[PDB]
Amino acid sequence: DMILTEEMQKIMNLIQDDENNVFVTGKAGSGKTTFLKYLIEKSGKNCIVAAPTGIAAINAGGVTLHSLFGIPFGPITPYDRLENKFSEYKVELLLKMELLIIDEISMVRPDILDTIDRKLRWVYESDEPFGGVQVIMFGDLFQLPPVTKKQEREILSDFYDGFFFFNALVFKRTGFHIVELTKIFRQTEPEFINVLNNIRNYQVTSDELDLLSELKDRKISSSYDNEYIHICTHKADVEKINADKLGEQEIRNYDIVIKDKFPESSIPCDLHLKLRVGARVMSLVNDSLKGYYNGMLGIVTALEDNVITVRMDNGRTIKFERYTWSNTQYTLKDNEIVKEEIGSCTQFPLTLAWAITIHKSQGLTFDKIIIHVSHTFCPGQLYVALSRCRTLEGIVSDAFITKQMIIPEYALIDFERAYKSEGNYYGKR
């Protein structure tokens, strides 16, 4: 099924030289996550996969950056004392790590990368950036940026020119190639692709916003008994919609089981899943053999002790059983890095889905969406919402989309221009 595009080939070609660090990014729905999974499978026996959040790490089959490197919470400046001592076994592990793959790099503050650099140089007793470890980073700055507090920006401001990962001081001493994936798979309509790619970059014309005006529809947007999913900025609004529609009549509760070490912030499913016949639900896992994917929507038709029957919007009925997620850590076996399970959790891979937040929609595909617009969108939020849908016809909004809803981050525009001007490379050569 998978196509290896010229851009994907370029990435694989670059990493044949173990001195090359690489940032892989791409337009919405261009195969970043799929290609990450491909690269990991090809990445050999001294590779560690990490991500900045627990759910992202579980999804990637890796570990959190915080656990791997013992990173404290909050901003660390280059001058803050790093005394966090690793265990002997952790040191032995890191000394065998030849390649570090980081997913969702776009949400990582620059000081995090500098702390990783510092700790690896400490472990390797070396002046070489990252202790000489090869680094491959995947993300999308235009969809999934960091969220920072004012106090955090104020601490970092004396040391950093900006608050994205590429602002890390380590990139005065090393650098990375960039490959952007530009073949879009999710959308197929050139007109839709063109407006999405313009919105992505805040190069959109107030004149394209007319094409989007036809998406506004009061009746559909105010309906909750269709097969649209309501995409909202705020968790509280999503919770209210799902709770209101769930109601209190004939509800069944299904409790999570957690075994051993599995931090709550890593748990990707509901702790106490409450459903009824007729509830709109979304699948949380990819299982091609069983005929569902992460993000697939349906309606509950039956509830039993160990099976939840759901008629999916594609017409297929699926008997969902409980799914088990595995929490791992890396260890050594001989001189090779291997994974070991340290905990697990078990629950039906379903969640209520009349509504979803923009944040929880990240990376997912939908056929029919209702976008609840906001006059206080943050950068990338409208783009993420629109780019969830396969086709223009599947999108409805509750009000006209306007230029006020597209907030630019000019640092990102400048970054893109900078690396392109240097042969798709950023930092020290």
Ligand X SMILES: Nc1ncnc2c1ncn2[C@@H]1O[C@H](COP(=O)(O)OP(=O)(O)NP(=O)(O)O)[C@@H](O)[C@H]1O
427 binds ligand X per the rule CB under 6 A: no
3 binds ligand X per the rule CB under 6 A: yes
126 binds K ion per the rule CB under 5 A: no
**C-alpha torsion sign, points 275, 276, 279, 282:** positive
Count of CB atoms situated within 10 Å of the CB of 111? 26
Residue with the two structure tokens 């223009």 = 392
Which residues on neighbouring strands pair with residue 318, listed in sequence order? 310
Contacts with K ion by CB under 5 A: the residue count is 21
Show contacts with Mg ion in window 325-384 (CB under 5 A).
363
| Three-state SS at 9 | helix
- Smallest gap from Cβ 262 to K ion, in A, equals 20
Helix (H) or strand (E) holding 325: strand 323-333
Cα(12)–Cα(318) distance, integer angstroms: 37
From the list ligand X, Mg ion, K ion, none, pick the one residue 141 interacts with, judged by a Cβ distance below 5 to 8 Å according to partner type: K ion
R_g of the chain computed on alpha carbons:
22
- Smallest gap from Cβ 307 to ligand X, in A, equals 26
Quick one: which of 30, 64, 233, 327 contacts K ion (CB under 5 A)?
Answer: 233
Residue 96's closest CA among 128, 131, 71? 131
- Smallest gap from Cβ 107 to K ion, in A, equals 11
Tokens at 170, concatenated: 């380590």
6 binds K ion per the rule CB under 5 A: yes
From the list ligand X, K ion, Mg ion, none, pick the one residue 186 interacts with, judged by a Cβ distance below 5 to 8 Å according to partner type: ligand X
Max distance between CA atoms of the chain, in angstroms, equals: 65
Cα(55)–Cα(38) distance, integer angstroms: 19
Show contacts with K ion in window 23-52 (CB under 5 A).
25
Residue 71's closest CA among 89, 86, 56? 86
- Smallest gap from Cβ 254 to K ion, in A, equals 6
Closer of 3 and 289 to ligand X (Cβ) = 3
Which residues on neighbouring strands pair with residue 100, listed in sequence order? 48, 135
387 binds K ion per the rule CB under 5 A: no
Quick one: which of 10, 14, 20, 34 contacts ligand X (CB under 6 A)?
Answer: 34
- Smallest gap from Cβ 181 to Mg ion, in A, equals 11
Q: Are 344 and 324 in contact (CB under 8 A)?
A: yes
Site string for ligand X, 357-396 (x = CB under 6 A): ------x---------------------------------
Give the footprint of ligand X on this chain (CB under 6 A): 2-3, 26, 28-34, 140, 143, 185-186, 363
Give the footprint of Mg ion on this chain (CB under 5 A): 32-33, 363
